[PDB]
Amino acid sequence: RVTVQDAVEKIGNRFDLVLVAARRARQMQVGGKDPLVPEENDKTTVIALREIEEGLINNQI
Amino acid sequence: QDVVLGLYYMTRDCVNAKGEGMVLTGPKEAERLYRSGLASLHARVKVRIT
Amino acid sequence: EIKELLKLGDLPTSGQIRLYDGRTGEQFERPVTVGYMYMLKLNHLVDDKM
Amino acid sequence: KPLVGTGMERAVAVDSGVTAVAKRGGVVQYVDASRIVIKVNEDEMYPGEAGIDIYNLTKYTRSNQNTCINQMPCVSLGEPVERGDVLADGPSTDLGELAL
Amino acid sequence: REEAVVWDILDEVIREHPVLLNRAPTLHRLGIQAFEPVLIEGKAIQLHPLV
Amino acid sequence: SVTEFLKPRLVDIEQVSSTHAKVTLEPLERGFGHTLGNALRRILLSSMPGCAVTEVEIDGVLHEYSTKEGVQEDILEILLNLKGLAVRVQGKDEVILTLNKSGIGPVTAADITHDGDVEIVKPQHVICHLTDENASISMRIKVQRGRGYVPASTGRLLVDACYSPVERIAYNVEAARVEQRTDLDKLVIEMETNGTIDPEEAIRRAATILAEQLEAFVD
Amino acid sequence: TEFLKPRLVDIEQVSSTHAKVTLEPLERGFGHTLGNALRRILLSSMPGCAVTEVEIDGVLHEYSTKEGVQEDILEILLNLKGLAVRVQGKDEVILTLNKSGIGPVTAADITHDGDVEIVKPQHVICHLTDENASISMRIKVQRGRGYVPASTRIHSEEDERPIGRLLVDACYSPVERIAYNVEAARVEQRTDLDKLVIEMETNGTIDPEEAIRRAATILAEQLEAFVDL
């Protein structure tokens, strides 16, 4: 997977999707949390985008 | 340019061809008909479509 | 005069030949030009630029 | 050789000075892809001379653009040659035709 | 030393790290684009035909 | 080395349907992905043996040209739709079956007189729809054993025969690599088949057909 | 089910290098299917025998020259690359060569053996051109298959070869072109039985009566993975 539009359906500003995907990927890489989506050893780059697909992320979290 | 050349060639109609004028149940047997060399690609046909 | 030379060889004067694809041995549709162009390697070869 | 050319190759390859060209007529005395040496005939010799034109060929050497330039013989031992015949190919030539 | 492991590592490093290709001049935004790389034996950059 | 060329293992059966699968091999020597992919293709699509509908006799017709009433789609379509029926014939060259149905509604291959000697491997195949209070139709369907796909070139209605069960087969070759080279081929074979035979076994049948040719040369 | 199986009924060694072979009868399509498969296998995978290193007495690298010889040492390597020989039950062998006195040098000058057989004695290595001139060299041959360029080979050897060896690129595959053709033939009073003809040009080290069976064998064992699934 690569095209992020379905995540942009959820974060309706596209800039906020980069700020949110970075924040969440940092909670994984740096903050030591782990994903609510099943990871496949993807990069956090892709995991965080795959966490928007589960519909369970916004910049409240 | 080459992609469109190929698609032009694939979709022309040539009024004489091998296997021209028969009736088929779908693309898949259209392909079997082409690949086995039984029908020419720009031959006229009728098919069921969906 | 090119045709005349190709006729003196035992060659096809259309200049074109039918070819087959070595991935399957299928024939190509319509002949294609085949012959001896002259080609130069230019001094812009890649490992000198990568 | 290019199979299709214009007949200008017979001139560019000679006048460009890079093929080694027989200064006087004679017969090939020896060849070894480094030297070619010609027993010039007495109809074109100068009277006090030994009468023998060596041509020490340039072998593998950098061009100003780093391509190599090794000259190679086109003659055979005992072969006759006439003034202005190509004795040795240059780079990009054969039998004295240009051949890029 | 380019040891036999390093490629299996490399093909894990790169496994989805976008790389940015741009020609020059680059008149307009479409003139820098990112692609996922896939490894090649040669020395040329294999670009996609439509792009 | 000199006679121990690399051999694949199936990397996956990669199955997406009982009708279609994507059997993939790795590694193959350079260029063998065609030499086997296409070779098995040309076997599979044209020289697999099997059984298919070959001729039809609907009640009282000389040519599917006659659009007999009571049926929604005309006889040209019933004729091709009956080509659509996949069938298994046990031990016989040609077998005739009878079909009839009555009442307003569809007709299905489940309504055939099922001999048990023959299996209609997809009963739920709709044949036509009926269109009057008195609507009923009765027909003889001939099924025959044969090989490949044979066109309509050769009251009976003739039809092309689909003896080969492969609906489609396609293949690709693609880059694969080992620890020191990437000039080797992967092979992907994709095929889709009419339900008479499962594809991961149809290919094992086809590999046998091809192997049997070589049996007179292999040392 | 009515499949006729082939036998390799006939062969014509039209030259010491070129031959025809025929496989007969075949069903529908199998004339094409084998016809191309065997061509593609014969070109890729027939094993053969190539020169692989050369050591010449007084030379130091490919680009040098030898006094009294008509070729740059490089064009000697370009000549030996084309030399082809059989070897009997060996993975490699070393051939010595010696010549002196003016004139050509040809493969007939190699120190012959029972266990090496050369396809064309007249293939020429250089000329000598001076009365006292000489060359002596130790040509090393290896068996193999496909093509292996010396640049990857020395990167595969991983010890450092001595000064004064020359390396040549390896081109083992012994068949230079293969053609196939399909036609109907008299058997069983019936039509559409293909006489496959395969006809071939080679470096001269092998005979079709091996080659087609070896190609069929390679195919037959590669194909095992598809029945063993």
Sketch the domain layout of chain F as residue ranges: 2-49+164-219, 50-163
C-alpha span between G85 and G143 (Å, rounded):
10
Q: Per the CB < 8 Å rule, is C24 touching G180?
A: no
Please name the residue of chain F whose CA is at the shortest distance from the CA of residue G89. Answer: F2
In the block, residue with structure tokens 């000064």:
G163
Strand partners, B23: B46
Task: Please count the residue pairs, one from chain C and one from chain D, whose beta carbons lie less than 8 angstroms apart.
Answer: 9
Pairing of strands F157-158, F136-147: unpaired
Q: Which tokens in the block code for residue G216?
A: 């069929």
Is A48 in a helix, a strand, or coil? helix
C-alpha span between F176 and D95 (Å, rounded):
47
Q: How many CA atoms lie within 13 A of A10 on its CB side?
A: 18
For chain F, the DSSP string reads -TT-----EEEE---S-SSEE--EEEEE-TTHHHHHHHHHHHHHHHT-EEEEEEEEEETT-S-TTS--TTBSS-HHHHHHHHHT--EEE-S-SEEEEEEEEESSSEEEGGGB---SSEEES-TT-EEEEB-STT-EEEEEEEEEEEESEE-TT---EE--EE-S-EEEEEEEEEEE--SS---EEEEEEEEEE-SSS-HHHHHHHHHHHHHHHHTTT--
Q: Please name the residue ranges forming H helices in chain G.
A: 30-45, 73-81, 150-157, 208-222, 224-227
Method of determination is cryo-EM
Correct CATH for A1-61 of 3.40.50.450, 3.40.1410.10, 3.30.365.10, 3.90.940.10: 3.90.940.10
Chain D: list its partners (3+ Cβ pairs within 8 Å): C, G
Note whether C21 contacts G: Cβ–Cβ < 8 A. no
Evaluate the CA torsion angle F193, F194, F200, F206 in order and state its sign. Answer: negative
For F67, phi and psi rounded to 5 degrees?
-80, 60
Q: Which tokens in the block code for residue B46?
A: 């009728």
| Residue G109 distance to chain C (closest CA, Å) | 37
CB atoms within 10 A of CB F107: 25
User: Which residues of E fall within a CB distance of 8 Å from C46?
Assistant: 43-44
CB atoms within 10 A of CB E17: 10
User: Which residues of E fall within a CB distance of 8 Å from C50?
Assistant: 43-44
Note whether D56 contacts C: Cβ–Cβ < 8 A. no
- Asked if B45 contacts B39 with a C-beta cutoff of 8 angstroms, the reply is yes
Task: Looking at the structure, give the CATH architecture of the domain made up of residues G1-47+173-229.
Answer: 2-Layer Sandwich (3.30)
Instruction: Choose the mutation target among B18, B24, B34, B35 for the interface with F, i.e. most F CBs under 10 Å.
Output: B35
| Residue F180 distance to chain C (closest CA, Å) | 20
- Asked if A53 contacts A36 with a C-beta cutoff of 8 angstroms, the reply is no
C-alpha span between D13 and D93 (Å, rounded):
7
- Asked if G151 contacts G62 with a C-beta cutoff of 8 angstroms, the reply is no
- Give, for D97, the enclosing helix (H) or strand (E): strand D97-98
CA angle C25/C31/C35 to nearest 5° reads: 100
Note whether F190 contacts B: Cβ–Cβ < 8 A. no
| Residue C16 distance to chain D (closest CA, Å) | 18
Note whether D59 contacts G: Cβ–Cβ < 8 A. yes
CA angle A23/A24/A26 to nearest 5° reads: 65
C-alpha span between F199 and F165 (Å, rounded):
9
Long-range contact set of residues A23-27: C-beta below 8 Å, sequence gap at least 24: A23/A59, A24/A48, A24/A51, A24/A57, A24/A61
For G105, phi and psi rounded to 5 degrees?
-120, 130
In the block, residue with structure tokens 């519909």:
A55
For G135, phi and psi rounded to 5 degrees?
-140, 140
C-alpha span between A11 and A26 (Å, rounded):
18
C-alpha span between G187 and F173 (Å, rounded):
38
Q: Which tokens in the block code for residue G56?
A: 């010449």
Task: Report domain G48-172's class.
Answer: mainly beta
Long-range contact set of residues A3-9: C-beta below 8 Å, sequence gap at least 24: A4/A49, A4/A52, A6/A52, A6/A53, A7/A49, A7/A52, A7/A53
The torsion angle over the Cα atoms of residues G151, G155, G161 and G163, rounded to 10 degrees, is 40
* Residue type at position E16: E
CA angle G53/G58/G63 to nearest 5° reads: 65
User: Which residues of E fall within a CB distance of 8 Å from A43?
Assistant: 15-17
In the block, residue with structure tokens 């739709």:
F81
Chain F residues 36-55 with a CB less than 8 Å from chain E: none
| C-alpha Rg value of chain G to the nearest Å | 22
Q: How far apart are the first and last CA of chain E?
A: 36
C-alpha span between G68 and F66 (Å, rounded):
95
- The 3-class secondary structure across B1-50, one letter per residue, is CHHHHHHHHHHCCCCCCCCCCCEECCHHHHHHHHHCCCCCCCCCCEECCC
Q: Which fold has domain D18-92?
A: OB fold (Dihydrolipoamide Acetyltransferase, E2P) (2.40.50)
Task: Looking at the structure, give the CATH architecture of the domain made up of residues F2-49+164-219.
Answer: 2-Layer Sandwich (3.30)
Strand partners, G21: G11, G198
User: Which CATH number is associated with domain F50-163?
Assistant: 2.170.120.12
Please name the residue of chain C whose CA is at the shortest distance from the CA of residue D4. Answer: C38
Please name the residue of chain G whose CA is at the shortest distance from the CA of residue D73. Answer: G70
C-alpha span between G199 and G15 (Å, rounded):
12
Contacts of G134 by beta carbon, 8 Å cutoff, 6+ apart: G68, G98, G99, G100, G128
Pairing of strands B23-24, B46-47: parallel
Measured over all CA atoms, what is the biggest interatomic distance in chain D, rounded to whole angstroms?
47
For F180, phi and psi rounded to 5 degrees?
-140, 0
Could you say which DSSP state residue E26 is in? -
Q: Per the CB < 8 Å rule, is E41 touching F183?
A: yes
User: Which residues of B fall within a CB distance of 8 Å from F83?
Assistant: 25
User: Which residues of G fall within a CB distance of 8 Å from C27?
Assistant: none
